[PDB]
Design a protein around this ligand. Sequence first.
Ligand SMILES: O=C([O-])C(=O)[O-]
Ligand SMILES: [Zn+2]
Ligand SMILES: [Zn+2]
Lengths: 111, 146
Amino acid sequence: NIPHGQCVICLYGFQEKEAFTKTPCYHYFHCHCLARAIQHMEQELKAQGVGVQCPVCREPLVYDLASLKAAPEPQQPMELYQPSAESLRQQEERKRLYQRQQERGGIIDLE
Amino acid sequence: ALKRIHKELNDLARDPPAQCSAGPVGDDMFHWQATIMGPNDSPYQGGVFFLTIHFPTDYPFKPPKVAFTTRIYHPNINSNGSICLDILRSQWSPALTISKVLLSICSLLCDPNPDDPLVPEIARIYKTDREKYNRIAREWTQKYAM
Ligand SMILES: O=C([O-])C(=O)[O-]
Ligand SMILES: [Zn+2]
Ligand SMILES: [Zn+2]
């Protein structure tokens, strides 16, 4: 029915009524996500001189860009960032290490 | 870019690559600091190395800019902290992640690529006198990163 895995471009999974596609190399992407990837590849190729390829496995890709662009963009809630108590403790320790390196002339300062 | 950046941040908090950390500098989600503990298979063992990460507007479709902040003696990293590494330029893909980039740099520290150097004298020494090379790399680690 609906794919159980993750889209590697946006890092979200697939939900009911979302628009997604499956490549000939067996990889699933939201339609919107693959469209964006292809646009960038087309730009880079032109600036050097097809070579549009799957982001996962590098297999040359067949596609229709307009069809992919027409699909609805998934509405996906942003994942909040709430550092755990342990993470906050770890960040404080890093601050101390950085300070010592500065004193040693061990930090590159490009100014 | 921002939703993708939040996803990565949460994954790197749950399950970061061995010996590494990464998170935002202050309030700015597009500028991160990372750390690498010197790999046990390298002359950087025991040191902690800070790096800077800047995400471009079109991330993840263009690569992050990654440089060393901690001084390091290596044929592929210069005195400005610039890193010569394929996946940071010609070989980037939107399937890659910061977690994967950190894993790649760890590998480069263990095994340099002397034939594509940023520092010709260090490359000459690496190729002609590895004993001298590892000695100097350890000496810089001890002075600056420990
Ligand atoms: O770079 C230096 O000056 C050193 O490691 O002694
Ligand atoms: Zn997606
Ligand atoms: Zn593929």
